[PDB]
Structure formats: C-alpha cells, structure tokens
C-alpha cells in the first residue's frame, strides 16, 4: 500500500521548439497534442513528454521498439541526419541522450554472476 | 513503426547507498539488482537505472489525490528538498516538486494529462 502509481510525463528543456517539433513528431513519430509560447506536450510511446524552449551526460532516456523494427529505426535516425553514438544510443537536437532496446530491460537482468539479484 | 514503450531511465548518482535509500525507501521502490558502482529499481512501473560517478529536465510521477498528503509529509519527514509550486499546488493537492539526493527534479502530480488538456482548453492538435 502507498505506492507511486505511474510515471506521468517528462519535461526536456530545448533550444529550438521547430527543431524539437520535427524530431518527436516526424522522426521518432509522436503525436504533437498542443503548442503554447516556448511549449509542446507530445504523447510517444505511452509518455507525455513536455518540451519548454529556452533560448548532458547524467541522464538518458531509452524506449522498446520491435526486435523486427531495428534496421528500420536505425535507418530511419541515420538518414535523418540524427546524433548516433540491440541497440541504438542517439540525442536529440539538444543533446538529450536516448536509447532504442529490442528486449526489456528485465530480460537483460535476466542476461547478467557477482552481481547481486533481489 | 512506433516505438512501443519506456524501456527505462538512467541517472548518474555521487553515492548508490544514499540514491537507495531515497528511491526504495522514501519512494517505495523495488531494488531488483546492484553492481559495484550500479543499481536497478522498479518504481511506479518504470525501471530505473542508477551508475554511481564521483533545470534541462524533470521526471513526473502521477499519485491519487486521496494519497497527496500522505506523499508530502513522506517528503517533509525524511528531509527531502521540496521545491515551490504554482500558488495553491499543495492546498488543491495537485502537485509536488522535489529533487533526489543528487538534484534530480521529480513531481507528484495527481493530474493526468487528458486533465491537463482539458484544463487548457495555446494552439490544440
């Protein structure tokens, strides 16, 4: 009893809200739900994400795509021009570091011996 | 061809044994594993990854309203960095704003976003 029930949104801070537009919506195909001054709340892969425009390595963000979607995903973000550093590590255009995995992030629990398993 | 879901969130962390404490104890996560500088939680049905290394971002969990005052006296009590809200954000038990050990700004909200849009009704798509 007491528990957080869900995650509710993130908020990215964004240089550009045209170029952050273009990159949620088209490239990674979200669904851009309003605009405001200096903001735009998209919802991408069940997440609302928050983007507030003002004019880093301590944090990545990672989503689960279809084993059978990699190559098209990696395609996709390498003829978009986007920043690539299975699985794809890339930021957005402000340097927001994220991730595309074809496997949960449990079943690589279950992958790792002196670890420590709860 | 969409991405299908949160795979999980990863934050760097100064020390591992005082991150633990905050998201399993305080938050009432699940720590599922650890390495030497790392550790795994389930928290509100998100994994989190923390890797110990000795503003631009927030994180935001949704809460039911009947639970608010529980999570802020949770907060008040263990010490937590509670940060200011919108005026009467705490009265109408809508959000709470605070940072983790290290400065990572995360919320309590009790609205969803279907309320948040409604509330609005900016350019509506």
Known sequence: HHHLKSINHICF???NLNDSIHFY??????KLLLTGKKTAYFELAGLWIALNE???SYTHIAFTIDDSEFKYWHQRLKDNNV???QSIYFTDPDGHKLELHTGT???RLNYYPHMTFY
């Open 83 to 85: 920043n690539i550093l």
């Open 105 to 107: 992030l449990e079943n």
């Open 54 to 56: 003002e004019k880093f």
């Open 13 to 15: 801070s964004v240089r």
């Open 25 to 30: 919506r088209d490239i990674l195909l979200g």
